[PDB]
Design a protein around this ligand. Structure first.
Ligand code: HEM
Ligand code: HEM
Ligand code: HEM
Ligand code: HEM
Ligand code: HEM
Ligand code: HEM
Ligand code: HEM
Ligand code: HEM
Ligand code: HEM
Ligand code: HEM
Ligand SMILES: *[C@@H]1O[C@H](CO[C@@H]2O[C@@H](C)[C@@H](O)[C@@H](O)[C@@H]2O)[C@@H](O)[C@H](O)[C@H]1NC(C)=O
Ligand SMILES: *[C@@H]1O[C@H](CO[C@@H]2O[C@@H](C)[C@@H](O)[C@@H](O)[C@@H]2O)[C@@H](O)[C@H](O)[C@H]1NC(C)=O
Ligand SMILES: [Ca+2]
Ligand SMILES: [Ca+2]
Ligand SMILES: [Ca+2]
Lengths: 146, 143, 150, 149, 146, 146, 143, 149, 143, 150
């Protein structure tokens, strides 16, 4: 799935919901709040970013880098060459950690709830689910995102 | 093309709107004369008495008031040819002594249409109805 | 109902269209443009034979790419001209007298491109209303379909 | 039941009131009557014979003048009531009965009447909107011209 | 009476008070409310327009046609030929009903109160009284409007 | 899944997002607009309800009964017997139609996008996923929603 | 000077802004054509069919819509030369029959730049990027 | 500790978002990557040799394309965080460690990088403000290029 | 006619108003130069160094800042002839090398008066006081 | 702190400057103009020797009066050009390449004129901020002090 029309629709819905400046920090804050509320045990996998307190600038920096990379991956949805080249780069960065692939599931559920509630009712969930599988498959490589 | 009865009606309402109620008339008068003397700078030579040198003088602004008010009468009576011919023939007597060139009427014709469209807007302006009806007004003053 | 293209739909159609279609974002046009004819060729098999000049057989050919953008850019004008119907009527007669000289252009062809647009738009445009879209899409096509055959 | 949307009806009423209200001099109301009926009789010369009672042989007569105002007042009534569907349905039904009961009037007359208005009004109204008028007028035409041959 | 200056003044005061669109329906509503409040017995003379309920679309249509004709008569105040031609036409329409001429008196009193209260204090009652006699005389023909 | 904790939060998230009065009719309109946008073929599955015109009073009546049936099933999430009784009664009504259960998957995607886009960012997508399958299974009878 | 890739990007965003979303396009179209026929009144003679006599006619406003929409396509594809050359060569075939003078392109070039800068503002307008890139568009239509 | 004033930071973020957001087509993001790096390699030809992993020998490659986005996404991250001094300090410290640990990178490279941006951006942004950018960028440059030879 | 002491005072206050406080000066500068190069397109050839090709360049906007600031000094000292003659003679030395035509002063004279009246308004503009006093400023720069 | 000329100071500096310096009030310029060079000549004794062309020895000479107004009118342009830094940079390079041809113009000379302005402004301008003033005054001078000696 994840055709070109869905890719372009995802970019327009992401760019609107993401915002710029102060809105980006508050956007990524609610997503990780959902991640820690959906999967409470995944919080202690980030002791290296001072995730004990979500307000710490070490975790605020971790939020910025993660959603920032998600912003740059979504921006390359149209072009496959650099998308896959970056998905592979993120793969070779996350694979050494050896993380559970079920967290990328929880990541999408939090992203859908965060983008959907911020974008509004016209949130295209099937398009976001289909195109999120492309991202998680490029990072995890796990068959879980077929 | 031709100044029919419908083209008259639309010109009347647009002139009343563009003319205003006396608040934007000084601006309406100054705007039209600046086009004439930009397109025809030699026409200044015909209005020496009203100080055509300077558009901003109250003496010339009084002349602009004269020509605007006189033009308002002809537009108001475009529907009624009987009294309109009387008014245009009346204006024809005063303007024949000046020896005004026929092209000079077409310059103030175009300038008035620029002035009107500047006041009402291009989206509502009707050049065909205005050109045809302004030709009627100037033709009566010329003969 | 009345099936007429209301002022409400005009606002609704123009607003959803202007956000998805703009002059700064190239490729956003072409993706929408290529998808409509692609949907048309599958449903209408004997339709590619009408676009041989633009090489409709080869969809990613630069000649069919240019035609795709020309078609929906003219659609963008019509949607933009929904605010000024007088200019729209004078323009719709131009496309009408332009399309019938192409032999094979039929009312059913514009009916198939309507279903082609009803499926493609909700995938790229959020807050897409199909009823409001179709009622004004029909209003446009019938002005392009003044003098031609069913 | 429903005639046209409020936004479309709002466009029609405002542009109609611009060229037709009570404070207009009667001379402007006569220019409208003749121009519209002279154009109507050019489209349909067979329809001119029907206005015998209103002295149609001389359009400059006060009797025919008063007739054109009756028609325009009825049209002005319908336009300003485009937002009330209940009253407009009763109003359109009452004008139909008057015209159907009159002998010799066809439906093609009212359609030709529609094309006269759609052509006469653009030269009087600023930024005439043919769509919104076509959306609000053709319901009135069909409702008034309902039941006529 | 009813000279040309009064005729033109009546048109300007009528056009302002009448309004356009929704205002016309509410204007004519208050007039007939005054008619039915001034002359309560005149209500049952309109059983043919469902005047049992004033909100009925049959009576709302009757209101529209009456005040609409009053609007078209006032519009022809300046020109006598078409005014009298229409006043005679309305006469030949109302004469078959054989109505009491005292109702046209009550009609004017309601019109003056409705136009006066809607136009404001600058309502020219003597001009409206003089020019209303021209209308009622053209419709009724009764000497009552000398 | 769909534990009682998730059952109670869905009700709170539903009652808030559903609204009252005019909000109910507009909510269902946004949902059914999302369904036909997700699956255009599904709009034809309601020809006997005037689905050709979404603003038709017959479809507005259909939208009302569907969102009402959902409203009453979500409200019975805490009582098995009454929920499973009405849920099987809804199966006895939908089985004679022979509907493709994939449409019920599309029904869930629009429901989440309409509640989440209205409830906001705090929308619990995983809990709504787990509990909609209870409703879908009891209606569809299909192993897909296991 | 040259229409580089950066000068393309800035022209695209400025055109989209100056073009609008259909609300100010009639004004955008009328504004540009008034400059051409003021600078080159003899160019009216080439647009007889669209009633070039009167700018305010819906038939001509449809022609302004045609040329504006056609110009919007070339600006949208200035980054992509492959399909751009196809579009300019397509426009080149239709305009060769008119026998349009090369100077006439430079007049509408200048008028469009006046129209754009009138819509966006002089403080943000880039004449160097616009002149270089509009020369590219007209050159393809000429050959 | 402090990078630039809110008003200066407000000017930078708004003009940066004008030319860089998520909804932009990837082709416009590639024009930016090459033009900036081709100009960088013209100022510093010795710095071109360092991007071996991202296939710098062919800038039209998806690998180098994806690299330029990483750099721009990190730059886009820093600009939109100019108002939060606490997070930005942690963010700038993390990018320094990545670049210092990489062998062969000088401080003069980042300075030449600064003059490329100060020259590339004026041809893309309307009414580019060199002062407000110089007030907000040079803190980022020195903080990212801190600890490098 | 003549730049008397009263005509000086009115020119000063109107220039300060039309000049502004630095917010509308870039617009004030760009507006005046566009009139000169429209009326006299060959005058662009004299300003090659400041990139007179393009009005929107910061290098030329700096030149517009130079001439506006220099003109502001003469207006500020129109009442004080002693130091005014010093300032005009100072500007006379730099402008004699350019070989500027006397008519070229009258073009920028007219353009400045258009720029001022565009900023303050025609209803308050005084052409007689401005023409007489701007002739004084240009005469000192010429000799 | 950062010592950079913020947008806040630009607003603050322009607003306090535009009220004290205007085109209608002659003499207000000259009093401010004469006082700055007067303060400079006292602190820098070997500085009058740099303004012999304008007769800097005779301060009330009409030639030094004209120079005084020219200097601070150019300062008024820079403060006004703080809103448009691009035009400001292109202009600051002009004054920079203009001042070094005058032999003896040094960075310390512009440092002495800075203290000359820090003392004169609060006596004529109310609500004068010295920090905000200096940070933008320095920003301007360093653009005039691009290519010259300390
Ligand atoms: C689309 C999804 C994701 C994207 C784009 C993403 C991106 C990133 C980025 C950009 C970094 C920092 C790279 C750097 O330091 O230069 C990072 C680090 C990290 N990510 Fe992800 N991430 C995603 C999902 C996840 C998920 C689901 C997990 C599950 C636990 C995860 C766990 C981590 C961890 C533990 C680090 C190390 C942070 C540190 O110690 O500095 N990420 N990721
Ligand atoms: C549209 C047609 C015109 C109208 C309605 C009009 C109106 C008037 C009026 C009302 C006066 C006042 C006469 C008086 O009170 O003695 C006047 C004066 C004059 N008009 Fe016109 N005018 C028209 C066209 C022209 C044109 C086209 C010209 C020459 C290009 C012209 C030249 C003059 C002159 C020379 C005077 C007397 C000047 C003076 O009093 O010093 N008029 N005009
Ligand atoms: C309502 C949507 C449509 C729009 C807005 C549209 C618009 C256009 C435009 C702008 C052109 C090119 C005009 C030019 O070259 O100057 C064109 C060409 C053409 N159109 Fe359409 N069109 C539409 C639908 C259709 C449909 C349904 C057909 C069915 C056959 C069709 C058949 C053609 C053909 C055969 C050409 C000529 C192709 C060529 O030049 O090689 N169009 N159309
Ligand atoms: C929108 C279109 C029209 C409207 C609103 C309209 C309305 C009216 C009205 C208000 C009257 C006066 C009824 C009365 O005397 O009480 C009338 C009379 C009449 N109308 Fe129409 N009319 C329309 C079109 C037409 C057309 C197209 C025809 C014929 C081709 C026509 C033929 C007549 C005739 C013959 C009379 C009666 C004349 C008489 O009483 O002497 N009308 N109409
Ligand atoms: C200026 C005063 C009046 C005017 C202009 C006027 C006008 C009208 C009009 C236009 C109609 C409908 C014509 C049609 O059906 O085509 C009508 C009907 C009628 N009018 Fe009047 N009217 C006036 C005063 C009165 C008064 C004072 C009465 C007293 C009772 C009255 C009683 C009636 C009645 C009973 C009908 C019959 C309505 C029906 O059954 O359809 N009118 N009038
Ligand atoms: C939780 C999900 C749903 C619920 C609670 C629900 C509920 C209802 C209700 C209450 C009725 C009307 C009962 C009556 O007439 O008394 C109905 C009818 C119907 N439903 Fe559903 N519905 C759901 C989803 C669906 C889906 C996904 C489809 C197929 C795509 C569907 C197809 C139909 C059809 C075709 C009717 C017949 C309506 C008529 O003709 O009157 N429903 N449903
Ligand atoms: C910037 C370059 C131009 C573009 C994008 C452009 C665009 C267009 C378009 C799209 C049409 C519609 C053709 C059709 O549908 O048949 C057209 C027609 C035309 N253009 Fe242009 N045009 C350009 C330059 C010019 C210039 C500079 C001239 C002459 C000065 C010119 C003269 C004409 C003529 C004579 C027609 C046909 C007129 C008619 O249909 O009656 N074009 N132009
Ligand atoms: C504001 C300026 C810059 C920013 C914001 C920036 C940011 C970044 C980012 C985000 C990455 C990706 C890190 C990752 O893969 O997780 C990166 C990688 C890299 N950067 Fe920079 N960068 C800048 C300037 C420079 C300069 C001037 C040079 C050298 C002259 C340079 C050399 C490199 C190299 C060699 C890599 C790693 C390439 C690879 O992984 O194959 N960067 N930078
Ligand atoms: C109202 C009278 C004028 C004033 C106050 C004025 C002011 C100035 C000023 C202050 C400069 C800067 C000189 C420098 O810093 O070296 C300048 C330069 C110049 N002016 Fe004028 N100017 C005036 C009239 C003119 C006119 C009418 C022309 C020609 C039509 C002209 C041509 C030039 C030229 C060629 C330069 C130098 C261009 C360059 O630097 O490349 N000036 N002007
Ligand atoms: C930052 C504040 C200053 C500004 C705004 C400024 C501006 C100016 C201006 C506008 C001129 C005349 C340009 C012309 O004639 O076209 C000038 C001349 C000159 N300036 Fe400055 N200046 C400043 C500070 C200084 C300082 C501190 C010195 C120290 C020596 C200096 C030395 C000179 C000299 C020697 C001349 C030439 C005098 C002459 O022509 O006889 N300036 N300056
Ligand atoms: C048409 O009729 C005109 C009659 O004049 C009008 O009608 C009579 C009843 C009077 O009321 C009068 O005041 C009106 O103005 C004639 O004057 C005219 O010549 C007739 N036209 C033709 C061609 O016969
Ligand atoms: C530069 O590299 C180009 C390769 O094309 C791109 O990279 C490969 C891996 C594919 O993903 C392809 O789809 C991409 O577009 C060459 O086409 C090009 O000739 C190379 N340039 C030079 C000068 O060698
Ligand atoms: Ca003429
Ligand atoms: Ca060229
Ligand atoms: Ca002079």
């Amino acid at each position: 799935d994840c055709n070109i029309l869905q890719r372009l629709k995802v970019k327009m819905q992401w760019a609107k919901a993401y915002g710029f400046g102060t809105e980006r920090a508050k956007f990524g804050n609610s997503l990780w709040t959902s991640i820690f509320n959906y999967a409470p045990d995944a919080r202690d996998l980030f002791k290296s970013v001072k995730s004990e307190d979500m307000r710490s600038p070490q975790f605020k920096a971790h939020i910025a880098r993660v959603i920032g990379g998600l912003d740059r991956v979504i921006s390359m949805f149209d072009n496959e060459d650099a998308l896959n080249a970056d998905l592979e780069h993120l793969k070779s960065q996350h694979d050494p950690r050896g993380l559970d692939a079920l967290n990328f599931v929880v990541f999408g559920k939090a992203l859908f709830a965060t983008v959907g509630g911020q974008f509004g009712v016209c949130f295209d969930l099937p398009a976001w689910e289909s195109c999120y599988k492309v991202i998680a498959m490029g990072i995890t490589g796990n068959d879980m995102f077929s | 093309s031709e100044c029919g009865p419908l083209q008259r009606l639309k010109v009347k309402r647009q002139w009343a709107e563009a003319y205003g109620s006396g608040n934007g008339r000084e601006e309406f008068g100054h705007f039209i004369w600046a086009n004439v003397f930009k397109v025809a700078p030699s026409a200044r030579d015909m209005f020496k008495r009203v100080r055509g040198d300077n558009i901003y003088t109250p003496a010339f602004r009084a002349h602009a008031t004269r020509v605007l008010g006189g033009l308002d009468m002809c537009v108001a009576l475009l529907d009624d040819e009987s009294v309109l011919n009387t008014q245009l023939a009346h204006l024809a007597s005063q303007h024949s002594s000046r020896g005004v060139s026929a092209e000079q009427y077409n310059v103030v014709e175009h300038a008035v249409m620029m002035g009107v469209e500047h006041e009402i807007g291009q989206n509502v302006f009707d050049k065909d109805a205005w050109q045809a009806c302004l030709d009627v007004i100037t033709s009566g003053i010329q003969g | 109902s009345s099936n007429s293209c209301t002022t409400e739909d005009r606002r609704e159609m123009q607003l959803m269209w202007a956000n998805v279609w703009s002059a700064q974002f190239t490729g956003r046009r072409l993706a929408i443009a290529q998808a409509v004819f692609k949907d048309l060729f599958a449903h209408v098999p004997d339709a590619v034979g009408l676009f041989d000049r633009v090489h409709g057989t080869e969809i990613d050919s630069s000649e069919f790419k240019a035609h795709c953008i020309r078609v929906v850019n003219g659609l963008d004008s019509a949607i933009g001209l929904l605010s000024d119907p007088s200019t729209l009527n004078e323009q719709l007669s131009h496309l009408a007298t332009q399309h019938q000289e192409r032999a094979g252009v039929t009312k059913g062809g514009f009916s198939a491109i309507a279903q082609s647009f009803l499926r493609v738009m909700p995938q790229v445009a959020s807050c897409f209303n199909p009823d409001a879209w179709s009622r004004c899409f029909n209003r446009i096509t019938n002005g392009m379909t003044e003098g031609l055959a069913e | 039941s429903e005639f046209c949307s409020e936004a479309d009806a709002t466009i029609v009423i405002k542009q109609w009131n611009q060229i037709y209200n009570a404070g207009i001099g009667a001379k402007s109301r006569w220019t409208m009557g003749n121009e519209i009926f002279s154009s109507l009789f050019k489209l349909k010369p067979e329809s001119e014979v029907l206005f015998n009672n209103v002295n149609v042989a001389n359009m400059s007569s006060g009797a025919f003048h008063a007739h054109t105002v009756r028609v325009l007042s009825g049209l002005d009534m319908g336009i300003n009531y485009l937002n009330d569907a209940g009253t407009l349905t009763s109003l359109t039904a009452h004008l139909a009965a008057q015209h159907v009961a009159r002998t010799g009037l066809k439906a093609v007359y009212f359609d030709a009447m529609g094309k006269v208005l759609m052509t006469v009004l653009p030269s009087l109204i600023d930024n005439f909107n043919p769509d919104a008028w076509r959306n609000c007028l053709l319901p009135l035409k069909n409702a008034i011209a309902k039941g006529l041959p």
